[PDB]
């Protein structure tokens, strides 16, 4: 069962959480779901946090985890629904060997450095490519409007 | 698969199946199911009691009658297209001249020699299958000269070619893939899709040469034109020739197809035993009596009496003929069994199909199948002649091999058949004929959730054409009760998945004695194996794919537990990536799934957006309604009013065609140049392997017209207007109008004055227009969403998605989709071949014999794997159960930890203390399925809170559900300090 | 009585449902409690799909019915 | 210690040549075959002379003479 592996990974990760993550805890009733605060560094996202939900399917790790933002975020490749198209989570590139630590590292890198190779919001990617300053201002507005206060 | 060139020759062939005993009945059934055009039976002997124990066409009422005549009715009833005519006269040279393939099942040696000589004189294919007890032979003569069109079982290789060049070698470069390793020098190749080299298409096939680093060549292409791009290069199968000796010469020097020298020598000993049996039957006029010591001694003496010249002189046998093997064959050669008949009939029917269709590689004239392991072990008592004497029961043909006590033990059993499809139906037939549960104290059970479908009905035999729509379990149970009236089958419609564990609880699995699983998926097989391991039940699992086959048995504590491939189980239900849909479809399967999901979201989601959601509570003011309306309404026509025009034309189809490929590619190129990346500026490679260009429709081309036809038919079907198939008149009507686009180029894009629409420049006018269209659709007829139905050919789903995938793949330069990818797709799957299904069912029947026999060592059981196209069959004993240990504890994959809760339910701290004291292990994590109970890394206050609480009360409090009534045990998974990262401790069974 | 109600995310959360009450009025409350769109998945017992025009008594909703939902569509 | 020259037959009637070692484990041969064919390790099991191959055992036990054929068998899903 994948539950034992997920519990062990969470216990290992809580001892040494990455700098961009905080208060990563799971509910004991359903341990196949995680709740975390993402703390990026690149502006304007670094002024606040982002609560995301990580769900592990029962056949984990042979099915990659489904990561979805619970709070809104203005990103080139993140939908308003909160879905993500990380290359590691993709079926053709996923392997059972990789842990969730690498996935979280890739997610933090993706948030810090927006990607335009696979835009899940094509119009926003076009706006970023044409006038990056307008995209920056819109991202600032979205963060200040929907973001959650950055914890200490 | 269903091959048009091959199947034309199947219906034109006529087959003679002589000696219609149990084996001949199986061969005739398989040939009728596969669809041979004619089939002539020949067996004038009266039906005996022994024949009923292995033949399913004959019933007790058909006793004392000619077997061929009695079986003719049922064989004709199995398939209407097959014409089955009984032959009353004796075998005559003219009759054998008329036929194409003849089969002699369980015929005498003299008749075998005579008919084989007569057939080999006229070039008629000849097969002489036989089965004497638990050992069966097979002979296959296809004349002096026989040419097989295609030796292998594989689609011809196609690989996408990157760049080709001119010169004396004329080397060409292809995209990296497994086909590069697959391609070999001296082969034959053809090409049909290439940009440039116009006359190279449809040219004669030519050879190639393999050079280092995946370099190939075609020859001299300097004289040809310029090469732009290349779709694929198709491999060409090389015809092969086989020469088979006649039967009379082959008997002296047999050529056995085997896998090892030991197997060859064992087959030689079996051949000597069969020759001895034939000689004994000739000398005395009577087969050996069941388990008669004197007849067995005479047979083994005849086996030794055979001349040394009877063997090949170029390879002497390492040892003389083992008297034990010949004696055992002679003793058990009285009756004919049902599993052996099924297996040999499957193999013989596959060989007959090889003869008729000239496909695959024919058998090398001799195959011997040994299944003597099913006999009682040497320590146990062998059946006595008095037990094996027939008593007039329909099972006497099996009692003459196994005895009365084993038949009673079979009658006493109580099994469970999970899944009744093809393997399920034939395993049910084997269970019925064998006698499993045919008694008051016995029973059976069939679990099935699906309904009968015509596409799957086309191959199975327990199902009939008038049963479409009825549950599979009910019909299978009725057929099983028809085959054996004493059998009592209980058909259950509820499936066996983790969501139904309350129906199939502890009592249900306490009633049964064994499980036989014939399932189509890996997840279902894994779940059933887990349930059987939890309840310690014997499992009989089989699986086929094409001509492949596999039958396995997992008895508790003696064989390794079933472990499905986790990768395939995950791939069973996994979503496809979105990047290929978005910009770069790398393969043709990517554009196939792109078309599938695009049409799904265009049609399935359209219906709900028409009436339900818009009319219920929301409007265009939702997240993104204008995009949802734009993806469906304008692409299918401007509309905006109730369409009084006929919903079957071409005006709106070509608009969606252009928007699908041409307009989309143009928009993508507008977003970024095909050769450059705007952000990169100077990337590592400017436009690597990505150069899509707009595609223009050609009326003459069949793919475009087929796509338009499918789109129009599907739109008419979903809109509610009666749609007519365009292939007769409206295809010409769309051909009648060659240029509808020039008059409607600009206005069709968006509104009336939006050449590119910029970025959200539509404004309130277009938003209000979309709202008006939504209101019109809400008051208009509600569109009915249609699902993918392979059986209904009128919906035009598979053809539509294939056409769209081909169009977009040619648009991107991807090689066109082949039939192999469609077959590999879970949808549009082919039915399993009847032959391999019969083979796996017979092997499972043998495993059932061994299981019901009682306590058996691991060496008795056998896991089988076969490949009928390559006539590759293996039967190996399974591995010992894996033993993995941690510290002093040692456990297998079957055993489990037991800890009673006592009269007062133990606290969690009490449970941990008991575990530490008894099994010497300290638990750091202890889950109940998914909920966590105790953790070593928890805070001391939280642990001090959780420890005193009652275990069952804690489980109820975490889950929020009351414990299931009558639940004897509770399963918990635990770990230990310092354990391996991948170790798997046995589950903790906690009583409550 | 008690009927096993389960979600596709691994949490059952059994709810009070009875045959005397219409199934739709309970399904809407369950959907409102969960917070996920109803068009994403169709509730279904024993593999029998449920339609907006489909009588529940014809198929015989069994006590402790095996009702679970299957995810569909493509969010992006 | 010298490298061996054995060929593993595919399930589609084709074959490929592999360079292995007597002390090399069967799991390594499975890894090489999976890498060449592109299929998962657990989805297939490879056999030699009619008997299956155990992962943890070395190739020396099975007696793989050079220029031998090791058939590749897939786990079958269809029912
Ligand atoms: O002969 P076949 O290959 O078509 O077999 C498919 C049969 O399998 C049934 N099935 C599938 N999965 C299950 C489970 N988990 N439990 C019970 N039956 C199952 C189908 O009814 C199908 O006919």
Author numbering:
A (entry chain C): 2 to 153
B (entry chain A): 21 to 1012
C (entry chain D): 82 to 157
D (entry chain B): 79 to 157
Copied sentences from the primary study:
ISG15 is a ubiquitin-like protein that is activated by an E1 enzyme (Uba7) and transferred to a cognate E2 enzyme (UBE2L6) to form a UBE2L6-ISG15 intermediate that functions with E3 ligases that catalyze conjugation of ISG15 to target proteins. E1 occupies the apex of the Ub/Ubl conjugation cascade where it performs two main functions: (1) specific activation of Ub/Ubl in a two-step process that results in the formation of a thioester bond between Ub/Ubl and an E1 catalytic cysteine (adenylation and thioester bond formation) and (2) recruitment of cognate E2 enzymes followed by transfer of Ub/Ubl to an E2 catalytic cysteine (thioester transfer). While Uba1 (E1) is specific to Ub activation, ISG15 is exclusively activated by Uba7 (E1) and specifically transferred to the E2 enzyme UBE2L6. Here, we present cryo-EM structures of human Uba7 in complex with UBE2L6, ISG15 adenylate, and ISG15 thioester intermediate in a conformational state that is poised for catalysis of Uba7-UBE2L6-ISG15 thioester transfer.
Previous studies in the Ub system have shown that although the single-loaded E1-E2-Ub(t) complex is capable of catalyzing thioester transfer, that double-loaded E1 is significantly more efficient at E2 recruitment and catalysis. The double-loaded Uba7-UBE2L6-ISG15(t)/ISG15(a) complex was prepared and imaged by single-particle cryo-electron microscopy (cryo-EM). Two reconstructions of the Uba7-UBE2L6-ISG15(t)/ISG15(a) complex were subsequently isolated, which we refer to as Form 1 and Form 2, with overall nominal resolutions of 3.38 and 3.21 Å, respectively (masked at 0.143 FSC). Globally, the Uba7-UBE2L6-ISG15(t)/ISG15(a) complex exhibits a conserved architecture in both forms of the complex with the AAD, IAD, and FCCH of Uba7 engaging ISG15(a) and UBE2L6 sandwiched between the UFD and SCCH of Uba7. Cryo-EM density linking Gly157 of the CTD of ISG15(t) to UBE2L6 L121K and linking UBE2L6 Cys86 and Uba7 Cys599 are clearly visible and only slight structural rearrangements would place the relevant atoms in position for catalysis, validating our strategy for trapping the complex.
